[PDB]
Design a protein around this nucleic acid. Structure first.
Lengths: 49, 89, 67, 103
RNA sequence: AGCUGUAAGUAAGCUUUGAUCCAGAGAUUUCCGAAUGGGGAAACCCAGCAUGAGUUAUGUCAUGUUAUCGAUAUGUGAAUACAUAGCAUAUCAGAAGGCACACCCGGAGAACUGAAACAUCUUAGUACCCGGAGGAAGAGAAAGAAAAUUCGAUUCCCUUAGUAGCGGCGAGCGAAAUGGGAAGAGCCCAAACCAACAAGCUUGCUUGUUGGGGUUGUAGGACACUCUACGGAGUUACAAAGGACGACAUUAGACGAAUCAUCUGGAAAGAUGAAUCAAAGAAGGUAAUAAUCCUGUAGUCGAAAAUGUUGUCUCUCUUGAGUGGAUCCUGAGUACGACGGAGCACGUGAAAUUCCGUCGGAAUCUGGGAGGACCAUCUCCUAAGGCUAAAUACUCUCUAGUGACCGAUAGUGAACCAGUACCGUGAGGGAAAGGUGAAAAGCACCCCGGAAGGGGAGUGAAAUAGAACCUGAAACCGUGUGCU
RNA sequence: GUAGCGAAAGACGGGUGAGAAUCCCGUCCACCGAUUGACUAAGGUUUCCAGAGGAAGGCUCGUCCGCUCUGGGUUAGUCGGGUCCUAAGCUGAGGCCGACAGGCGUAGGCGAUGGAUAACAGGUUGAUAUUCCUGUACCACCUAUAAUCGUUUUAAUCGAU
């Protein structure tokens, strides 16, 4: 999803995204070591380089 | 093939003026070439062909009592054999 | 009419096809030139050709079911 | 229900009480035609192989509901059922036995 | 026993040797189009490879094959050495597009409008767009709902109730439990533990593979303790008879009772009179209004694809092993928290409860979670793994039917030539137009006339019923006249 | 029974016909004349040619017609296009970016309005013509013909991805 609202002090609403913290790093996909996007939360303890 | 690409002959005053010469006019299939036409008439009538010219005619519009439409498109060939004749009437 | 065609010999069929085609061709020619006077031959001739091709195809199907 | 070579009576029309022989049926609109029944007077023009011709008196069709078969035994008007004999089907009279009709 | 489409008959013919027709099965099935050999201004152009025909030879023609991703088996290998990338083959056809986007699930997401202006709010998570699948989808077996002495996984209906509550406390939004009912179903994994298999290691241990075993709380399982299995038998998940399996609806289809006369009539089913059948008096046609004239109806007999999917249905099933639970296991970047947001009837805040993003970040049965901030006592439960029929929702369709629904300016836009004439560059918009008569018997012939038209004659019950054809209103146009 | 009947020189004779200012033929006259002429593209799509016809159309009439009916008519090795090349632009396997849809982009491919590319005179029809016929030529492909290069590296020729 990643969609919601930005709110003013008078509670006026405007549509807005929430983007993830993608970082480009070299990981070892099945095969060769590929350079790919991945999230910091993901590579916290989800994957090795 | 060789008896289905030729369908009908054409009988008109112009075609008869041509048949005064060695020229004979046929109506053929719309997908075939003059080479196939020559080979076919040589196979059937057992003659020798010199030249074969060809044209395409468009569909002609027609009406009949509140039912309009188009005729069929037709392909006409004219063969100009060296020697021989064809027993048409 | 299809009775004897089962009895024919798989090449008599092939010759009869082209004989029938020659007949059809001559009939169409002498129809274009307006001396035919018997126009129902054309239909039955076409249907005869259809009979022949049908029996030949099912012969091939039997051969392939055997193989 | 009837066939082509039958002898029947007319129940309804200008001709009623009259008998006749049927000569054609026309089943897809259920109108038979009977000799001596429902006579037209056509104005004939000159055709390609005939003279002009004046009037022409021939028969016209007639609905089947206006026609009934005759018991061969009694020569009375009767409906018609069906009976099976050795796999074949025949016509019965509903008052007597078989009615033979081939022409 | 007739037949040669709707659309008619001529000429030709076909037909009892069983035609035309009515169901079932099969064969053939040009070109375009996802279009897939390449290209392309759809329905066209241009090729190649291998066979085959022909040709003295080409030429030409025919038959197959030649798209991109993917799956299954192989070798291969540059900047840089084996290795793989990548590249090159063999087989398969797994997907694309079109859905009925009506119903269902996700992503994204308005405004007019109401608040008698307007911004929180509302319209509304509506319309539209996109993607998915399907015949249903979704949900679903307690880290629950509740406080009785408790309760049944989910879904749906009626009530609770326009209640409680939310709300510029305005407009307005709006539950739940309980109860009564439809349908009723609980099954499997991971981990402990055990027995084998190979490598590291030296077969001790570890790793991983296979197989058992077991997946639940007033605690379940493994180990500790104790004695049993096809008794029941269940394919809607959890195994299966795949079974002789005993009316698909017994469906195309076939049989299917009983009326005569006279009057009027052009023609009777009507009137009069006398009869009959009824498990059939439903309906429609027939020259007018028919239970007994026709098609039919009730009812009976019926075969292929079939089985009604129904009754013991071979195999196969599950005849349970109870106590303590002392020790071990019981789902981690998870729960949870802060910030910003959204969804829950709840306006973002005490948010209790449930989700997204960014940052942090735990406990392990003496444990952990919930019970509208938070603390304690009590009650209930045991998350971070999965599957699951029924009742339910809709109908482009199909079969059989129904209507105090329309009856040609109505009713579908369309009863007929309809999404057609026509309009528009294009997306798109979009009409008008039914009725001779019972039967075509559709006016032979004569006269005027160039013909159209007509006048006779004739058909017909009727021709001011003649195809500009049922009835034929008014406006409007005329010709004659009585009064003026 | 009104406005209007869309710029322009017609006259007479003869003919056809039921019927003529309006149709055919003839003579005279007049108009355009760097055009009211003759070709070629685009566009249109049978309006083309013979007969037949006067119901409707033609701003009158009509024996006429671009109207109706019946039947006919377009012939290419050399003309213009495709089996050749590319420009702008459009698509673009891998690839980049992106809520979805999708956008961009490399080799490449498509794409003339440009480049390359072999035929001229005469005759002839109611309707086609550098296309049919005659004559004389030119340009490519294949096959037999034989004097010339005679390792086939090289060689005129083959000869590049």
């Amino acid at each position: 999803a990643s969609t919601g609202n930005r709110r003013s002090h008078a509670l006026n609403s405007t549509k807005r995204r929430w983007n993830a913290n993608l970082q480009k790093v070299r990981i070892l996909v099945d095969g060769k070591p590929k350079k790919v996007w991945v999230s910091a939360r993901a590579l916290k303890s989800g994957k090795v380089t | 093939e060789a008896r289905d690409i030729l369908k009908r002959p054409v009988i008109t005053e112009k075609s008869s003026e041509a048949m005064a010469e060695d020229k004979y006019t046929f109506d053929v299939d719309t997908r075939v070439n003059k080479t196939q036409v020559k080979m076919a008439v040589e196979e059937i009538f057992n003659v020798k062909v010199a030249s074969v010219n060809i044209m395409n005619y468009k569909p002609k519009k027609k009406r009949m009592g509140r039912y309009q439409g188009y005729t069929n498109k037709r392909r006409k060939a004219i063969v100009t054999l060296k020697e021989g004749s064809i027993d048409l009437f | 009419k299809a009775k004897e065609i089962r009895d024919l010999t798989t090449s008599e069929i092939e010759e009869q096809i082209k004989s029938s085609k020659e007949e059809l061709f001559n009939l169409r020619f002498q129809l274009a030139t307006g001396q035919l006077e018997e126009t129902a031959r054309i239909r039955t001739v076409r249907k005869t050709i259809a009979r022949l091709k049908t029996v030949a195809r099912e012969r091939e199907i039997e051969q392939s079911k055997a193989n | 229900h009837i066939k082509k070579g039958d002898n029947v009576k007319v129940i309804a029309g200008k001709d009623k009480g009259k008998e006749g022989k049927v000569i054609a049926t026309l089943p897809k609109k259920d109108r038979v035609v009977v000799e001596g029944v429902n006579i037209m007077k056509k104005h004939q023009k000159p055709t390609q192989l005939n003279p002009e011709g004046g009037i022409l008196e021939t028969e016209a069709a007639i609905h089947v509901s206006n026609v009934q078969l005759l018991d061969p035994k009694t020569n009375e008007p009767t409906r018609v059922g069906y009976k099976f004999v050795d796999g074949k089907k025949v016509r019965i009279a509903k008052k007597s036995g078989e009615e033979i009709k081939s022409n």
